[PDB]
Paper text:
The large terminase protein is a key component of the DNA packaging machinery in tailed bacteriophages and evolutionarily related herpes viruses. Typically, in addition to an ATPase domain which powers DNA translocation, the large terminase contains a nuclease domain which cuts concatemeric DNA, generated by rolling circle replication. Crystal structures of the large terminase nuclease from the thermophilic bacteriophage G20c show that it is most similar to the RuvC family of the RNase H-like endonucleases. The overall structure adopts the RNase-H fold.
Structures for complexes with Mn2+, Mg2+, Co2+ and Ca2+ were determined by soaking crystals of the apo protein, whereas the structure of the Zn2+ complex was obtained by co-crystallization. Only one metal ion, bound to the site A, was identified for conditions containing Mg2+, Mn2+ and Co2+. This metal ion is coordinated by the side chains of D294 and D429 and four water molecules in the canonical octahedral geometry. High resolution crystal structures of complexes with different metals reveal that in the absence of DNA, only one catalytic metal ion is accommodated in the active site. Like RuvC proteins, the nuclease requires either Mn2+, Mg2+ or Co2+ ions for activity, but is inactive with Zn2+ and Ca2+. Similar to G2P and UL89, addition of Mg2+ resulted only in limited activity, leading to production of nicked or linearized DNA when supercoiled DNA was used as substrate.
Author numbering: 254 to 442
Amino acid sequence: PAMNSVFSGLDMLILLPYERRGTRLVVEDYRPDHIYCIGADFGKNQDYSVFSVLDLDTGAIACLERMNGATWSDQVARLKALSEDYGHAYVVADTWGVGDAIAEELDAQGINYTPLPVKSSSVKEQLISNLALLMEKGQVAVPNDKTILDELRNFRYYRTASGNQVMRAYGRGHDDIVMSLALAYSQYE
């Protein structure tokens, strides 16, 4: 890790085997005695959308779905299917700047969701610090997928011109997986 790495506890991250089924990485199938939620961010244009299914009873990711180039309606339909697959798991959705169509469609399609708009650096910092703390404590368990691990590894601290802290991917990288995981783990006690 570089000096400015956010996830200093990456050594305590539990790595899980999985089966790749198209856009899903499936660690385990639905356990009906457990309660699940899904962290969801939505991509515009060629950006990725990432849905992270978290078993709230074990603290482990059961399934992670990631894709780009999907229509807005297809993003919502895939989220609905994942929710239904995991017992009508509730969605923690980053609703900031998602647009009228997706907002209307979540409601119109009866998706079980709670809004968590990542509307400022302050909100992002709360989400991230919670994930990072849980990680150091050995409570975060994710699919052992190099893309996921690399995105976590490359998430770094910077400062703005006014001196405020910001967190973002190194170089010209992405953080859609990081934020999806943080949205899921925001619910974990």
